[PDB]
Structures are given as C-alpha cells and as structure tokens.
Amino acid sequence: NDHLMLARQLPLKSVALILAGGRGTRLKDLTNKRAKPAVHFGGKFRIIDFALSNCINSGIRRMGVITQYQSHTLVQHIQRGWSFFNEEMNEFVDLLPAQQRMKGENWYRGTADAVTQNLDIIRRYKAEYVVILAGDHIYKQDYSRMLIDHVEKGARCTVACMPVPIEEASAFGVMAVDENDKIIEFVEKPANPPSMPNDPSKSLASMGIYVFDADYLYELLEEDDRDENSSHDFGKDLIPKITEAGLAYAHPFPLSCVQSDPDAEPYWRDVGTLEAYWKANLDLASVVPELDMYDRNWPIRTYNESLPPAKFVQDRSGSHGMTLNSLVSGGCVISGSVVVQSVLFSRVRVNSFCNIDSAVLLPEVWVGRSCRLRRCVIDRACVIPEGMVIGENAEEDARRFYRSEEGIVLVTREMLRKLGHKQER
Amino acid sequence: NDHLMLARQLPLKSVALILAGGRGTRLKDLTNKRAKPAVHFGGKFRIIDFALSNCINSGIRRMGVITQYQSHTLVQHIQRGWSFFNEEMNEFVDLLPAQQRMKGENWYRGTADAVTQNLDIIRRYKAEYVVILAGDHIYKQDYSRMLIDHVEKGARCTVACMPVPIEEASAFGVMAVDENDKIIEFVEKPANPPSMPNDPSKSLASMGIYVFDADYLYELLEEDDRDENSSHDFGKDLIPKITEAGLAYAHPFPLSCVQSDPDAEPYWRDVGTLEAYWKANLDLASVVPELDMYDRNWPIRTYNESLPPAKFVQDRSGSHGMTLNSLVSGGCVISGSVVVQSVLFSRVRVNSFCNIDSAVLLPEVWVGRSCRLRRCVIDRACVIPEGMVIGENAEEDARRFYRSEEGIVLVTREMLRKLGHKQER
Amino acid sequence: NDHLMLARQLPLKSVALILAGGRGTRLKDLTNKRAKPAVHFGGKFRIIDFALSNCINSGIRRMGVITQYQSHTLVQHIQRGWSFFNEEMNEFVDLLPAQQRMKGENWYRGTADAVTQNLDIIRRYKAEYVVILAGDHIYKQDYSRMLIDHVEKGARCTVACMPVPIEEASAFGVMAVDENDKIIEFVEKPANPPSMPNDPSKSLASMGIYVFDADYLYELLEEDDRDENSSHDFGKDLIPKITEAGLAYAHPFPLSCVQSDPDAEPYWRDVGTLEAYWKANLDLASVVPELDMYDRNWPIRTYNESLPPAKFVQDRSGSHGMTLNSLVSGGCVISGSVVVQSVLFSRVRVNSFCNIDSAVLLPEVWVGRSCRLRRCVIDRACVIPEGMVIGENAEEDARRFYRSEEGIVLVTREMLRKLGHKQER
Amino acid sequence: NDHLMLARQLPLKSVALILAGGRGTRLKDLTNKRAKPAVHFGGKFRIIDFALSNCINSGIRRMGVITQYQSHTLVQHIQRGWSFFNEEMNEFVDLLPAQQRMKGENWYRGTADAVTQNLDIIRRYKAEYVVILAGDHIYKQDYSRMLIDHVEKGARCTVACMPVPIEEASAFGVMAVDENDKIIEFVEKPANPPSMPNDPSKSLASMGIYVFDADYLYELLEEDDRDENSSHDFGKDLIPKITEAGLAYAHPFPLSCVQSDPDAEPYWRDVGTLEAYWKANLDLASVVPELDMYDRNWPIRTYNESLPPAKFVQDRSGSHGMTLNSLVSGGCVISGSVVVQSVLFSRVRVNSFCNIDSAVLLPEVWVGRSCRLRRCVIDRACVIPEGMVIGENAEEDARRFYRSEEGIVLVTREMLRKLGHKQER
Ligand SMILES: Nc1ncnc2c1ncn2[C@@H]1O[C@H](COP(=O)(O)O)[C@@H](O)[C@H]1O
Ligand SMILES: Nc1ncnc2c1ncn2[C@@H]1O[C@H](COP(=O)(O)O)[C@@H](O)[C@H]1O
Ligand SMILES: Nc1ncnc2c1ncn2[C@@H]1O[C@H](COP(=O)(O)O)[C@@H](O)[C@H]1O
Ligand SMILES: Nc1ncnc2c1ncn2[C@@H]1O[C@H](COP(=O)(O)O)[C@@H](O)[C@H]1O
C-alpha cells in the first residue's frame, strides 16, 4: 500500500501516547519526589523531552502524556516548555492523570489500564494510528519511518525491536521473529532471556514502542479490561495476545534511528539503575559523545529557561579555575576550583578550593569551600557543607549516603539533613 | 504604615492560591464530569477565569491553583489559556493537584489540608501576603485595594465580607464586626444566620477571600494539621481560631469592587444551585447586564479559541431566522430558527424550525429539526434529536431529565442516551 | 527520483518567500493605508493568512515575508498571530522589509529585486527548494505535492499554472506547455492572451507560485541584478529567461489543491478589483460556500483575538432583529435591525432600525440609527451617521463616495470626513 | 495630588515610546549592519532589553518601539523575545517604522518627527502619561517612581536628570534647576558644559527620559511640526520650548534607580564610543559587578534562546583549559585554551592553544588554533583564521583592523575578508 504522499499524511492521522506513568524503583531516591520521565538529564533536559521531540520532528503533533506518580514537576515542565501549541492547527499535549472523584478511586491499575480509563477522550481525537511510547527512555527515533513500515506490511501492531546483550535482556520484552518480521514468540521479562539465532550473546528486545491500528487497540483493551486474571500491561498481557493471533510485526530500530554518524550503532539508554544514569550524562561530557545534541536536523525541545551566562571567577586567593571535559550550563558560578568529567546543571554555585571529578550536579546545588567530590550524583538543591569529602572512603560513604554496588554515590537533602546539615540556603 | 509606592510593591510580594478544589454538589449533573470552577459561563468563559483575571489586573501574577475533583478539563483549560507566563519575570500559574504515590494516598482531607500538603512548595515562592481565593465564584475584584486595607490596619488575616439576604446566609460564613472592622463573632454555615445591626433582613457574610500574613498562615496550619478533632477547613476551623485571638479584620467588598456604574451594587454570584447558574448567564443576554464584559479597564482572560464567525443561514424553506436579546458565540450555525433570551456557546449547530427561549446551550450542542426548548440548560455535546419538546410539560420533563423545583430543566448525554437517543454525531 | 520518505523531507529542506510586497492599485482606497495582503477577509482573516497557513499545513515552517508598502498593520498582524514559533525547531516567520540607512536608499526596485537585497539572509537558511509565493491571493494549496512533482520531473523551476477565462487572462502570466508539462512559450501580461489548445475560451495562467532550485535562483538573480535593461520582476524578466533555456516546468493546481468536494473546481480569487473583493466575502455567507472554512483538515491560522460573543438586542421599540445568510463575528452588537447577505467583522455596532443588504462591514464600524445599506463596502472604523442612505441612488453615491462601474460602493473615513461627518467615536 | 492607589493606576494610564531610532556614529563599525539598541551586551542581551524590561517591571506594558536605521535584527529580536503579549489585557509592543509609500517618502526627519508621523496611532492608545525613552542606553530604572514625582509636582514635562563629569557633559543635555526641581536653563549639547552649583567638576545632564502629559505632547509637536526652522528633536527644539514657559521639572535618577547595594552610586552607561562598550561588558566579568544581573527583583527579559550547555573539552594534546573572571554563555565550545577577563556570547567555538585576554567575543565567532587575543572586540560570526595575533603590535593592528585611540581593537568580517581570509564557515 505505497503512495507518493503517504509518508506525510500518516503522522497527521496519528496520535502518540506517552506512558510517563510510574517510576523506576531501580533509580533509588533519584525518584522519591518525581517521576522517572522528569529526571534531569543532559545539563538542561528531562527524559520526557526525548519521547516528545521525536513526535514533533516526526510530524506527530498530537501527544497524550499519561502521568500517575509524583507528577507535579513533570506537569509543571510540560506547562512551561510544551505549551506553545494551538489546538486549532490539530496539535496539543494533553495531560491525562487519573480522574479523581469520591476521594479514593480511579488510580490506574496497569500500563494498559491507563489507556482504558482515558478511552473516551482518545476516541474524540479520531486517530487511525496510535503510537504507544514509553517516555522514560532516551533515544532519537523517527516515528514517520516506523509508521510506514507498519503500513507497507499491512500490520495491526508493530513493535520496535532492537538487540541487546543477553545479560540485560531479563528486564525487557524478548521476542523471536521470522523472515518477514512477524513475531512468533513473545515473552515479557523472562528469567532466561532466549538468544537470537546466529547471535548467541544477544537477544531481540522490545523497546516499549508499539504502533497500533486504532480500530484494533480499542477492541483489544475493552476485550482485555473485562479480564479478571489480566495484570493490565502492554507487555505482560496484550502483546502476547496479538502475537498468538499472528497480527504482530517487528520494526527494527536501526532503520528509524536518527544518528549523525551512520557508521555507529543506534543509541538506546533506558537509564535503568543509578549507574547508567551517571554514565549516560558524562557521555555528553566526553570529546566524542555517543549522543549528538549539537544536531540541528533533529533538535530536542525543552524548557528554555532564562539564565545568565556561566560565570567563572577567581577564588579567595586570586587563583584560576581549571576545567577538563565538562559541561557548565547557565546560571552556574564556579569560584576558581577544578572541575573534571563533570556535568553541572543550571544555577550550580561552586565556592572556592573544590575538587569535582566524574560528578553530576543537578540544579541549584551549592558546593561549599574545600569540598572533594568523586563519582557522585548530587540531587536537586543539595547544600553541601564546607570540607565535605565524597568518593574517597567507600566504607564512610555507604553509611552516610547511598552507594551502589559499582561505586556511584548519591546525595540528597534528606541524606544530608539527617547528618545535621542545614539545607535551607 | 502608608508609603507613596506601597500600592505597587505588595502584589509583587504576594501570592494567590485558588481553591478550585472540590465541586458544588448543588449543581447536580452539571458537574459530574468536571469541577465547578470549569463550569462554562458567559458564552466563552469558565468560572475560574474570574478568580484569575482579578489576580492579573491586580498585579498578582503568581497564582496557585489547587485542583482535586475531575480536573482534566480545568487543567487543560489552564494549559491552553493561562500558560503565556515566563517564570523569569516572577510570574506563573502553578497547578497543585495532590501528589500520588503507593497508589491510594494523599487525597486532600479539607480546604486547609490542601494548602498544607503543598506547604513545601509555597515556602519556596517567598511570599509575605497569601491571598486565599475560592475560585468557584463570579466577581470583579481588585485585590490590590484589599491588600492595602490589610496593611493599613496592621492585620494578620483579612476576610472580605459583603452583606447578603438572611434567607441565603445559611450557606456562607456569617460574622459580626465593630467600628474598626474587627471580627468579633464568626460562625460558619449557621442554621439561624444572625442578622446585621440596623439591617434585620441581611447578614454580613464571608466570600471565601482571605488575605493572610504568610508568617501567620504557615504557623497556623502546622498548628492545625496536628489537631485530631479539626475538620481541616478555612471557615470551619481556622477563621474561628484567628477570630478568637482578635487578629481578624473585615474588608468590605464594595470598596475593592470594580464596576462601571458606581450607582450600582456590587455583583456577586456563586452560582450555587442550578437555577442561579441559568439566571446568571441570561443576565448577560439582557439589554443592561449587571455584569459588564465589554469593559476594557478590567478585561477577563480566557482560552481565545479559534472559531469562525457566527453563521446564520436560511432554513429548508428559504425563510429568515429571528433573534431577541441573545448571545451567539463563534462557530455557531443557526439555520433560520427563532432564538430568544438565550446564550449559545461555541460550535452550537441549530437546524431548521427550532424554537429556543430562555435556554443556555453549552458547547458543541446539536439541536435537530423542529425542536422546542424553553427554560433549559443543554449540557456539552448533547445531540438533541428531531422533534424533541422541552419545557412545556413539567410532568413529562421531570421523568425524562432533571427538573429543579423552580422549573429549570437540565439535559445531559447520559439523560438522552438512556431514552435510546444516539449521541455520537 | 522517487523514495519512500521523500514527501516529508523536502518541506524541511525548503523555505517559502511571501511577496507581501506592493499593493493592488485596482483595490482603490481599500488599500491607501495598508498592504493588499493585510486587507481583511472572511470576518476574521487577512489575505496573508492564506499564503501562510498553506506553508504550515504543507510542513514548510520557514517563511520569509517581504513587506514594502504600508506594512504597519501587516507587521503587527504577523507579530500577534504568527509569532508562536521557536527558532530552535527550525521554524520562523522572518520579516524582510528593505533595510534603511543614510535616510533615502534601499527601496526594492522590483518583485525579484526584493529577494536580491535579502540574498545574504536567505543563504543562511541553507535551503534547497525556495517556494516563491505571491501572498496577496486566496487559495488552499498543498505545497508538499507541488514540491514532489518538482522533484520527480527533475525540474529547476516549477510554475503553478491553472486555466482562467481569456477575458481576465490579460492580468496574469499566460504560458503554453507540452505533453511533459514543459513551458514552451511564456509571456507576461499580454494584450491578447493566447488561448489553450482545444479550449479556445480559456488561457493557461501563472498563479505567481514558483518553486525554485535554490542553487539556480541565487545564480539567476545575481546574473539578473547586473542587467541594466531588466525591470527586476519574476514574471517580466526571469521566468522568460528560464523558459528560453527549457528548464521551466508547469505544475497543475488541481493536483495540489485542497478541497472538501472533489467534484468541484479549484478555488482561486486574487481579489483583483473592488467588485471581486465584495463578491468573494459574501460567498462565505451563502448556504454552500465555494470556500470551506469549517474544514479541520486544512485550517487557517490567524490572529485569534479575544472578543465577547455576538450580542443581538432589542431595538428602542422592543422589537426583534432578523438575519438571513449572514456572518456575525465576535464583538458585534446588533440592536434589532435587518441584516441580509452581509458579513460583519469584529466589533461592528449596529444601532436600531437599520437595513443592511449585501454589505461587508469591516471592523469597528458604527452604523447609526435608521440607516439603509445596499451593495457597499464599509471600511475600518467608519462612523456612519444617523439616517444615511447608501446604494439606492447611484447618481448620489458616486459624487459622495466611490462607486465602481458594477455598482459596488466603498465608504471610508476620509470620504465621510469630507462631507462634515465627525469620525471620532 | 497624593491618593492611596495612585502608584498602581498611573502605569496603566501610561504608554512608553522607545526611540530605538538611529545609530551611534561613534560605535564605528559595530553598528554598520544594525541599530545601536540591537548591539549585543552581557553575554545574551541586547541594549533594548534594558529600556523594555524597566517598562514591564514598572507596570508599563504598552510600549512603542520607533525603529528607522538597520532594524532587521532589532525587529526580529522583538518578534522572538517580546511577543508574549496579549492585546486584550491592554499590553503590546508595537513596532512603528516609518510608513513607506510611492517608494521614497516618510523617512523620520528628527527624534520628535518620528513621534509625529505616528501621532494617529498613539492617540488610539488613549494614554494620559507618555514616557519618552531613549533605548540605546543601559540602566535599571523604575518609571512608576518617576511618574508619581511627576504627578505630585503637578508637572507637564519631567526630565530625568543625573550628574556626570563635566568632561563628558558635552554629549548630553545640560540643565540647571532650582529648590523645587524646576528647570531654569536648558541647553542641548553645549561646547562648554556649565557646571553644577557647589560641584564645579560635574554637570546636571539629561538622560533622554522625558515623561509628558499627553494632552501637552500632542499640542507641542503639532505646534512644532509646522515650524520651518526647527530641527525636529526633543533636546534641540522642544525641551527648551517647555523650559522657557516654566512647565518643565527635573526628576533625579538616584530616587527611581533600582540597585541592590544602596551604598553605591546609580549605574548609567550609554556605551557611547567603542571603549565604553568593551569596558561595560567586562564589568560583568569582574568579581563584584557594578551591574547586578543575578537580581530576581528586577529581572531583564530577553530572547531566551535554546542552547546546549557550555562545553569545555581537552585540546589536541590532552591538556586542561584555564579560566579567570570570565563569562561563557551557552553553545560555546572551548577546546582547552586560556580565557581571561573575557565575555563569550552564544555559540563561540574556541579551538586549541588560544590565549584570550580582556576580549569580547560576540556570537558565532570561531577562533582558530594558536590565536592570541588581547583587548579586542570580535564581531558577529567572525571566522578568525589559524595563528592570528591581535593586541600585541598596535602599529600592525591599526592598519589591518580598526583600533581606537585608547587601544581597543575591533574585528569584523569585512576587515578579515579584505585580508583574504574566507569567512564562510
Ligand atoms: N530549590 C529547591 N529546594 C528544595 N526543593 C526543591 C527546589 N526546587 C525544586 N524542589 C523540589 O525537589 C523535588 C524534585 O523536583 P525536580 O528536581 O524539579 O524534579 C520536588 O519536590 C520539588 O518541589
Ligand atoms: N464533543 C464531546 N463529546 C462528548 N464529550 C465531550 C466532548 N467534549 C468534551 N467532552 C467531555 O465532556 C466532559 C466535560 O468537559 P467540559 O465540558 O469541557 O468541562 C468531559 O468528560 C469531556 O471529556
Ligand atoms: N479604530 C480605528 N480608528 C481609526 N483608524 C484605525 C482604527 N483601527 C485601525 N486604524 C487604522 O486604519 C488603517 C488600516 O488598518 P487595518 O484596517 O488594521 O489594516 C491604519 O492606518 C490603522 O492605523
Ligand atoms: N552567522 C552569521 N554569519 C554572517 N552574518 C550574520 C550571521 N548571523 C547574523 N548575521 C548578520 O550580521 C548582521 C548583524 O546581526 P546581529 O549581530 O544579529 O545584529 C546582520 O546583517 C545579520 O544578518
């Protein structure tokens, strides 16, 4: 079903649904006061700016952001950086938190029980192709090249699949395909992830990116919402049901990936645990980042906050401040200290004589005089006191703060407030 | 404490808090799928555009909209018509729905238990004067003339009071004042509303508009949040506590009312029941409205939706359509029918041979051919079928639809869908 | 050169250039204080909302509006209704008025000498396909179906051509094509428009819509800007030069026309004279308009001004107001008068006892008591006095106001101010 | 005439008029392709963001920006950073370039002949107090404390005056006042600036900030526009005329100045010559700036451009980059070089082995490998080639580029393009 203009008409006949939804329990306390899509990233972004700017640059300007857990920061972010739309041009970012009445009802029992509470609003959009996006993930995808591959194949559901190492394939949806990219066997979060054919060390995993014939989705959820043994989830209940009827195809991600270096492999990081969050940000600080953010053909839209330039000033002794492979966003004030392999977000104040190495300083952090920081994640608005040392004694950082098994430290206000340090600057 | 520039500095040192909050159980099914602040009004407004445009024109550009019950329409309305702000100029409309975690917690136990869940966010605003607005009400108030009268008197709390007939004074907060506008006796929602001195037929009632010294509010809620017998409400728990310490003054509303005819009385309608909602809209349709909306010195900001002009066309027989004291907003298409004392909102389609009298047609209503409508409220998207008659047989309109004691009919999709009529045009 | 995704990539590689430019000397005094693209139309639109909303809905979000003559209203309109863009997403509406220095230089000698003054700014956009739009015209075109037909054919320039009656073909660019849609003979504004083959009563006319290979445009203007005998115009100088090299193809407009009734003919009105301006607006007032503006698949974006609903009130005698095939936009206040086949724009006040027939009342017009209006165009802010009669005595309307040869009257403030009538309400 | 609420009503009854207007011929080639109000400043600002954010924070939300010379950048900047207004709330930034018709007329003969061409538009605003702002100047003023001092005194015109050294008082309007702040003697740009009484080394100078009774301004310009010997300027023609009638008062700037350190003197820099432009930017780079831009009670609004964080990377040799009292805005990429006392604007790329000292690098500058820069101003988009040396040989920098008498160098593309260096990266 190939036509000259089909590539431009299908995004307009389409509607995206971001399951901002729940959290990552594996992100520890990075999330205790926010949703995982609203975790900061990149010096100025949040994670949901990746699953939203790919809808825009793919022509999909009708989005539906499903928010349940700690969404105040998320909703405020959509309000301030994603509310430039005009509903008359057939474009909008509708927020669909669970509707509360009688004071204790409607709380979204599953991933697919959140698209069923809102199934009277989504019909009104009159959409033929429903993209189902997990927006707690980081990528650069073109969903107007996955929609075609969906329309050429004559598919009803189209799961974006990409291979990953079998070691981490127990956290995603492993499938198995054929010569025509038809899903034969799908199993969600196995304990023994089956390998690919010819690639024993890797498994063909679902990314959480389903494209759906809308006439099939509505008839599949209402045919699923009445099920008493269902767990109400896309992976755990529906995609096996579609697969077992043979109506589920697989769309390889390398085809519909936007990357500035065609020789490279596609970039996917779901920032699962704490360690991959830290490792994902500092990749932007290296010399050749795996993720291009100086790209003008696929830009990422965010809250363009008004901040003054990054100021570097002399310390108390009149000396210089040295920097090496670091990002200093706007608002920062670094008073003559050494910053290495670091990422400083907005409004980070760093007083004199500090040493900062492989750190990520989320916004409004105040580092006090003579602090040493190594392999850490400093949370929002943390007021680090004077002479604090972090990342040199693992036995003394595990009983103060949180310390992952790989050596990454996390600092929060509650962790610092419990040691007596006042966090009200 | 009078200074030359005090009238301009206090709104900037101020923060408004709209308790969009719960519903009006007395509005019947007008509200079953929306909050009372999001009830439509005026052809193009919602009720919360009144409690928000008075903050803007009073200089208060920092608002806090507390939303709990059926807020999807409300939040979408704030997003599309109240998201032109820039957070750098010290201005914003923050939405503060209850934060949900663990799937069944944090549901706002009272009016004053919603400003206590959010008391870690409001401290961050660093506001000295907290205006506490009930935003389910209709008025034109200047809160930079109530803030001064609060600062001149040296008050800690300042309740906007206005007299109302003793008949309807059992639904508001009746107080009693002295020569210096100090509250002596406050009682919330009495069964026998005490009268005023010298005006036995009227009672001095609270409007739900408290101005607070912020250093006193925070210390009053935390001193109240620990109370086990409290009901967590401003009227029912706190304002008596302030009153009994003698720190509560009364600010007359006629002083800080914006009205284009100084000879008139101040305009306050809380659209309590169904009958006062209908009566309040048609007041705009009369020749001399009590509420001026063609006023340019105190304009009301709303979702400026892009709609085509109001089209009037000839009916099936080539005849004319007559109109008398009516409002026809944009999008409407009236095919040669008689419309009298009516208010038609956006996108109301009225086919031929209809007769419409003292009606209010909320948006996207479709009236079919040969319909007669008298003293009714047609809800959103109601698809009235052909030959329907409403408002001529009270015994036949009470057992089909809802009919108030005063004779006002209300029509909803669920009422029409239950009689077999398909509402999917 | 056909590829799966070519239909979506070419608008993003493209840049549109609207020649808002000069005026229509044939519009008489409708234009004396504005550019022809800023002439009002449709109850709420201006003409340049047609040549701009077709770029948006065609994916072309980089526009260049070239303005020279009386552009204050035009520029203010772009500012208030076309400034929702974010320059980071590769989208903008750049205004390119002639750059003034030394107080009397740089005044745009021709249509193609306005794209040559600005040829240092347009290179910076890095565009491969330059659409050249005359934006003083009314249509609904999809320029992402003309760009392909340009890329399939391997063309360098692609002129959108559509047939018109030979009677009015002396005002457009008549061409002649072959079996492959190659322009053979082009002549601009002939005195004897050549006819089509097989259609002696019609001529194949240029619409003023050129698509250009950018590498060819820049090399064609700089190769033309040095010409001393050139008149610096697209039609009169360049398109013959391209044609005579055989690099100019013709793109039929019926292919790339957006119309809701496929059985109909394409809609093109350049509102040439006064009579076609009046006739073009009232077409929207008829029962079946030739131009669909209740279309949601190709909406027109404009200045969504905040106006109250259209109010109809009783006259001084308590009587009704009748309407027949008319458009009443927002702000209007019609006090019980008869309005027929009319178009009332925003904020038109019509006092009692008026009779209005086949009129067009541009905004902020005040009609006084007992006025009769027939076949007229009332300009902006005209304060028609009491008892004025228009359109019943042609000999008495030609020596007061302007009256076309076909019987259309035009009323301006200067025409009314010269008869003594004060126009300062 | 003192009333409780007068401080808040007068800005709303007011209208500001920024004379963005002509250029500074003394800024040399900084301006050759832009107006002086659009000169960059501060890392991210332009100069007209100072004369506009003081209207906003002073409550004056109706501005009129008069633009004549090279306004493409200025108008584009107003469009993208000052077009968040809604005309219904009585707020706007109207652009008033001279209206062009017949191709060579209407070119604004003087400063006060630009408010007379536009005197039919300004009457429509219905403003009582017209602030007349020169917007090519840098300050932090509160015009709602100058308007009162104007209304208390019962003045007709109110000139903001502040003392400056008699050495530079030949470029401003020197006046002389009395005990009641009444102007006695005004003379514009004298050759021998008269001194103050008791301060022989300083002169009481006009800042170009006139507040006017609107009923007097309109009657003063029309009474001046007919004068054949007038030069059509506020200083040179009108203010002497008002002064000689005794209707002109003087408003001291230290009263209505917003400064975070009350012990300091008011900040006024008109960035007259090249040397004061350079000296004015680096003041922001010092440790204690004279101009506070980290102030939240009087923020400056600008084009909040979306730029990535400031990246510092290692040079070709793996080494560190050192910084000392510098501002690095967003977009910059500094590859391991030394930056001192500098100001880098957006998108400045600095390759390896550079040395940059007391420089100002306007946006999109590319510094090549092994460059030494000292006491310079690098203009927009300058592509400095490899091994260039600037600021070490004054005899070799005066015959290449422009070099002021005080030692400041200025680098432009035309200066670099004339030495053969290609500026097309
Ligand atoms: N300056 C601050 N100090 C303390 N908490 C903050 C600050 N800014 C934001 N927060 C809170 O930090 C939590 C996470 O917000 P965010 O980091 O924006 O996702 C929320 O509870 C915010 O209200
Ligand atoms: N065209 C429509 N048809 C049916 N329901 C609608 C329509 N538009 C809005 N609604 C719903 O009507 C309820 C009230 O919305 P509102 O009238 O906008 O407050 C909500 O549940 C909306 O989703
Ligand atoms: N209410 C009004 N009264 C008189 N002239 C106006 C009014 N509104 C706009 N204009 C002027 O009418 C001319 C045409 O403006 P427009 O009709 O908006 O293109 C311009 O000179 C405007 O400044
Ligand atoms: N990247 C660039 N390269 C060359 N010229 C530019 C660039 N950006 C802006 N300009 C021009 O530089 C002049 C000054 O612009 P601005 O610096 O923005 O005031 C104008 O003629 C602009 O069009």
Side-chain angles (χ1 to χ4, degrees), chain D residues 68 120 267 350 353 405:
Chain D
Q68 176 184 0
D120 313 310
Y267 183 79
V350 166
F353 310 131
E405 304 178 335

Side-chain angles (χ1 to χ4, degrees), chain A residues 51-86 88-104 106-112 114-178 180-262 264-316:
Chain A
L52 287 170
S53 304
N54 304 329
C55 294
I56 300 300
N57 305 328
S58 64
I60 299 160
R61 312 183 67 77
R62 296 188 274 174
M63 293 170 274
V65 192
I66 286 152
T67 85
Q68 176 184 0
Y69 173 95
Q70 304 285 345
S71 54
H72 167 60
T73 55
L74 180 60
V75 168
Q76 190 184 235
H77 174 62
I78 298 301
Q79 198 188 351
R80 293 186 187 188
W82 290 97
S83 297
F84 53 90
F85 293 106
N86 311 305
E88 62 262 29
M89 299 297 97
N90 303 308
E91 60 180 40
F92 57 88
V93 166
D94 271 17
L95 301 160
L96 307 174
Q99 288 307 58
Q100 294 300 320
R101 100 208 262 197
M102 101 211 205
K103 309 347 171 165
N106 186 340
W107 58 273
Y108 291 165
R109 282 73 196 204
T111 294
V115 176
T116 310
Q117 249 77 317
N118 304 303
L119 207 78
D120 313 310
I121 291 151
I122 288 160
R123 285 179 202 285
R124 265 192 289 291
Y125 298 165
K126 258 153 273 185
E128 280 144 56
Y129 303 108
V130 179
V131 191
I132 296 282
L133 301 174
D136 55 79
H137 289 338
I138 289 160
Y139 50 60
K140 273 185 153 183
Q141 196 175 350
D142 192 1
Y143 315 108
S144 66
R145 215 179 292 211
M146 166 169 190
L147 279 156
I148 330 308
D149 213 55
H150 166 76
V151 175
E152 316 298 67
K153 297 174 172 155
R156 296 286 248 167
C157 183
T158 289
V159 199
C161 75
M162 172 197 53
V164 287
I166 194 161
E167 296 107 37
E168 332 172 290
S170 58
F172 313 119
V174 192
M175 73 186 79
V177 310
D178 64 347
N180 289 337
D181 290 318
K182 188 179 279 82
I183 295 165
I184 307 302
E185 265 272 57
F186 191 102
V187 58
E188 169 60 10
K189 291 170 174 183
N192 185 20
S195 71
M196 287 170 62
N198 317 276
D199 306 271
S201 65
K202 290 209 306 314
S203 287
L204 200 63
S206 184
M207 302 162 73
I209 295 162
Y210 325 97
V211 172
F212 269 104
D213 260 18
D215 61 356
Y216 188 56
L217 176 58
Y218 307 158
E219 56 181 359
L220 188 69
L221 301 166
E222 290 182 342
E223 178 181 358
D224 170 281
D225 193 47
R226 313 197 176 90
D227 195 341
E228 55 180 35
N229 286 343
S230 176
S231 276
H232 308 296
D233 202 357
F234 274 94
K236 204 169 181 181
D237 290 301
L238 299 187
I239 295 280
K241 183 186 287 163
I242 305 164
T243 290
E244 205 159 23
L247 304 171
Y249 286 78
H251 171 60
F253 186 73
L255 303 174
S256 73
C257 191
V258 169
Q259 67 207 137
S260 308
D261 46 355
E265 52 166 7
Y267 183 79
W268 193 70
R269 302 298 191 275
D270 46 337
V271 181
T273 60
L274 171 61
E275 207 273 0
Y277 173 80
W278 164 93
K279 193 172 176 154
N281 269 287
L282 314 190
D283 168 72
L284 305 173
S286 63
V287 188
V288 181
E290 297 176 331
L291 183 57
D292 198 333
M293 289 274 220
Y294 301 78
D295 190 2
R296 322 285 275 291
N297 283 8
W298 202 270
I300 299 290
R301 159 67 190 191
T302 172
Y303 184 18
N304 305 318
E305 206 170 346
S306 201
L307 296 167
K311 189 184 224 307
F312 293 75
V313 300
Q314 66 193 40
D315 58 5
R316 274 190 12 191

Side-chain angles (χ1 to χ4, degrees), chain C residues 33-34 38 40 46 72-73 364 380-381 413, chain D residues 121 124:
Chain C
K33 288 180 174 183
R34 58 164 84 86
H40 303 263
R46 303 178 128 95
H72 167 60
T73 55
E364 307 192 59
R380 178 78 102 152
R413 298 161 62 81
Chain D
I121 291 151
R124 265 192 289 291

